[PDB]
């Protein structure tokens, strides 16, 4: 019998190659498709299938009118199942994903079989066609099925199609369909009337994006989200990796093969042998209650009851634009006739910058760009940064500009994320900052507000998800007389590790020395009394110019320093980020990067770091306004030991088409 | 310098380098007298960008500073990061040599040792070879301090270490060397538990940092 239209939206029709061959499969995961292995095998219906992307070109049609069409971009199959789950180019709007069922299945049990196989009399149907199964019997890593009748069957091109059962009004994921006697399909002989089938149980593998209490993650077992995926490998080795198949991180448990990761009632998350006694690797949290999500966003953080983070590995990539698992740039560019438009510089292989694409160019009159200041970060939680513009009124009002980045690299109209009339806040007094304070899996906006009568305060602006924001509040404050506005250099970023973000100060004390603070996140988003992490009378304030970033892969933030010497030559010295006798602090600085004097003139480029090849490591890059007046973009990687590689030549024009002076990139943090 | 009243005197520079030359982050340094004429001057293995290894040798001047570097060595079969130098007279040769104690990603550990030697008029640092091994797991090199010398009193340089154990116990091992520069088996000397000696809470007094 044919599905109603709007029905089983989650199943979705495969065409793999110039239509050379058909199969199933199931919404599991925004951006995830579930399907039988069988089908993309290098000999259909049986062997091993190759990982990574697929033999032929594929893609998938879903949605209540399968009107909806996706390209399958990898593979990651599995070996104990006839089970494969292939990543989407884009994620599907519009449709519900299947959750996978909490129970196992039993005998006498009746399940929903739905796919777009042939049928009875279509040997290519044009709608979804369904059937009863009732299950005989579980064991190992299928199931035993038959027909609740005799009248319908499980048919060839079916394979990979979803078996449902349906409970509270909706549906859980039990099985995909693989193999069966397929008596009384289309194009099979009538001699054979069995409808027997088999098929792997998808109920005893990982599933969704979150481990409960006393959740076990299996070997060659995996969670998904849009940005990342969590797997532990056959060797033992639990890792995270990127939509660019590179690993962010890793336990480093390799070669203990049996060894099963799992999230314990204390609430912390550990790798433990084949023994099931000895623990390799520890999160080392205490969180009962809690959980383990791996975001969309990107990276893995543990919760605890109270939804607070206390731990992240943090596996995300910066100002990630198109998804693709690498980090990019963009810049806002106003031309001297007025019209302005964005234009994105994508992340290459090499870790360099490929030629801008432009995107929302406007005609001259819709922005009046006097008083703006520019914010990057992922402020929806799509898994693919957005960028965000705070702007002055000439009737001094304000508002809070929000454009979502593109599939293509590009971005969408801006679009008010918040306002407020004239005589509360005022743009020559805020300086903005991007990252996610909250911890709440999407970027937020905080505010150092400098008042005139010399007193501060930090306002919060947290995310809603209509990607709008909420009311500011502010947290941490100072008496005038005390912070200095005009000596702050701030920066943001997780320094320690527990899953949220947020700001640094480096402050120029009195004698143009450099005093280091940072000032934790507090659970609600506000932020916490600072303390001083470094210091240093070696080094002259007015010429630092520092920067944060994760340039050695800990998983915790940490920080760098630009510096102009008097002799014409500068360099950047690294503080990598550690905790000693239970005391955070910024290490011992070392140089990791330097140049000829002359070579650079700090004052005539632009930098933004990120992470530019996707190797888990951030690293900076920069556009630099040449003597000619040529524009040139470098990117200097970062070595495992923080020191940096030669810078490596991208992207270049002559003045003629990009003006340097005329350009300001997005940032996460102002300088 | 030092006088004779077991003072010293003011110091005064010799060698030099400007900025953006040498990098202090990148610099293992040993002493010793590796060309046997009757003053001790220094050596560095310097990281080569990549991790590589080039050692660098300062000869000591008569008046007590040292003179322009020259390289004795290099090798980009190794990694920088996994090197730790030594410095002694490892076969009573008459003049000192190195040895690197390099920490493998396998878990184990090895010495190699480059003798000291003069051919074609050229001072230079001999062929690396393996003097000690260990199977892997056997010796942590962070856990461990070692200190170099002549310990039998055979006229032969060797090392010894104190390695903090598993559980706490602190076990002193002395591997002598033979005619060959090839080291002899482990020794074992004093031991205690951490109730006694506590082992990241005392420093050995040595000739070179590390
Ligand atoms: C003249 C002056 O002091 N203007 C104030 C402010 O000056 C700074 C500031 O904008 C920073 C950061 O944006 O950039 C430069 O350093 C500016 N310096 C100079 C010399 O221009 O600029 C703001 C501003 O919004 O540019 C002024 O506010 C005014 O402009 C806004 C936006 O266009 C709007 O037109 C307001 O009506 C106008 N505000 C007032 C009260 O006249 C700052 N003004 C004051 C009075 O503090
Ligand atoms: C400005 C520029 O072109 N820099 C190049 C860059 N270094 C930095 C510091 O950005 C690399 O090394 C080049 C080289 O030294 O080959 C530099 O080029 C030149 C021409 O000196
Ligand atoms: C650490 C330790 O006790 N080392 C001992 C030492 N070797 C090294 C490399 O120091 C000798 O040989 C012993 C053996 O192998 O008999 C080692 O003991 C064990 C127990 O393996």
């Not at 796919?115 to 279509?122: A, D, I, P, V, Y």
């Amino acid at each position: 019998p044919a599905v109603t239209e709007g029905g089983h939206a989650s199943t979705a029709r495969l065409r793999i190659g110039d239509d050379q061959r058909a199969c199933s499969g199931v919404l599991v995961a925004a951006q995830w498709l579930a399907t039988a292995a069988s089908c993309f095998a290098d000999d259909l219906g049986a062997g091993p299938v190759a990982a990574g992307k697929p033999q032929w070109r594929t893609t998938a049609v879903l949605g209540p009118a399968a009107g909806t069409t996706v390209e399958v971009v990898e593979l990651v199959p599995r070996t104990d199942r006839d089970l494969v789950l292939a990543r989407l180019a884009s994620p599907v709007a519009g449709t519900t994903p299947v959750p996978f069922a909490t129970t196992a299945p039993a005998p006498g049990e009746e399940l929903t079989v739905v796919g777009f196989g042939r049928t009875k009399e279509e040997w290519a149907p044009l709608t979804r066609h369904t059937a009863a199964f009732t299950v005989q019997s579980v064991s190992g890593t299928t199931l035993a099925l038959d027909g609740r009748t005799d009248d319908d069957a499980i048919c060839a091109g079916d394979a990979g199609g979803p078996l449902l059962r349906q409970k509270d009004g909706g549906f859980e994921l039990v099985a995909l369909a693989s193999q069966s006697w397929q008596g009384g399909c289309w194009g099979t002989d009538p001699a054979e009337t069995r409808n027997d089938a088999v098929s792997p149980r998808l109920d005893n593998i990982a599933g969704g994006n979150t481990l409960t209490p006393g959740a076990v993650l299996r070997a060659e077992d995996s969670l998904v989200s849009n940005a990342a995926r969590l797997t532990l490998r056959a060797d033992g080795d639990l890792v995270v990796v990127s939509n660019a198949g590179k690993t962010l991180w890793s336990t480093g448990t390799a070669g203990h093969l049996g060894a099963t990761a799992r999230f314990t009632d204390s609430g912390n998350l550990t790798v433990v042998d084949a023994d099931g006694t000895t623990v390799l690797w520890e999160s080392a949290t205490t969180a009962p209650g809690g959980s383990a999500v791996l975001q969309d966003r990107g990276d893995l953080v543990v919760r605890d009851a109270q939804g607070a983070s206390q731990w992240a590995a943090g596996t995300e990539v910066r100002h990630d634009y198109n998804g693709d698992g690498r980090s990019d740039m963009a810049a806002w560019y106003n031309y001297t006739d007025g019209r302005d438009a964005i234009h994105t510089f994508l992340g290459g292989t090499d870790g360099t910058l490929t030629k801008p694409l432009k995107s929302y160019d406007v005609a001259d009159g819709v922005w009046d760009t006097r008083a703006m200041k520019y914010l990057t970060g992922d402020f929806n939680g799509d898994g693919r940064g957005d960028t965000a513009v705070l702007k002055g009124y000439s009737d001094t009002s304000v508002k809070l500009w929000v454009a979502l980045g593109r599939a293509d690299g590009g971005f969408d109209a801006p679009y008010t994320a918040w306002s407020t009339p004239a005589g509360g806040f005022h743009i020559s007094y805020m300086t903005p900052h991007a990252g996610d304070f909250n911890g709440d899996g999407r970027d937020d906006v905080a505010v150092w507000y400098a008042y005139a009568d010399g007193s501060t305060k930090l306002w919060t602006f947290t995310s809603t998800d209509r990607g709008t924001f909420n009311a500011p509040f502010s947290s941490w404050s100072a008496p005038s007389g005390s912070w200095l506005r005009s000596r702050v250099k701030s920066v943001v970023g997780d320094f320690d590790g527990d899953g949220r973000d947020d700001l640094s100060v480096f402050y120029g004390q009195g004698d143009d020395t450099v005093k280091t603070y940072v000032f934790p996140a507090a659970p609600d988003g506000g932020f916490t009394t600072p303390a001083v992490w470094w210091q240093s009378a070696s080094l002259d304030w007015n010429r630092t110019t520092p920067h944060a970033g994760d340039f050695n892969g800990d998983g915790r933030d940490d920080t760098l320093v630009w510096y102009d010497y008097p002799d014409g030559s500068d360099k950047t010295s690294t503080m990598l980020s550690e905790r000693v006798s239970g005391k955070d602090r910024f290490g011992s600085a070392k140089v990791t990067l330097s140049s000829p004097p002359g070579n650079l003139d700090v004052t005539r480029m632009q930098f933004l770091t990120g992470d530019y090849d996707g190797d888990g490591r951030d690293d900076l890059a920069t556009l630099n306004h040449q003597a000619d007046g040529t524009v040139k973009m470098w990117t200097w990687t970062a070595r495992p030991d923080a020191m940096f590689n030669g810078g490596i030549a991208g992207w270049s024009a002559p003045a003629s088409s990009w003006v340097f002076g005329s350009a300001q990139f997005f940032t996460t943090y102002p300088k």
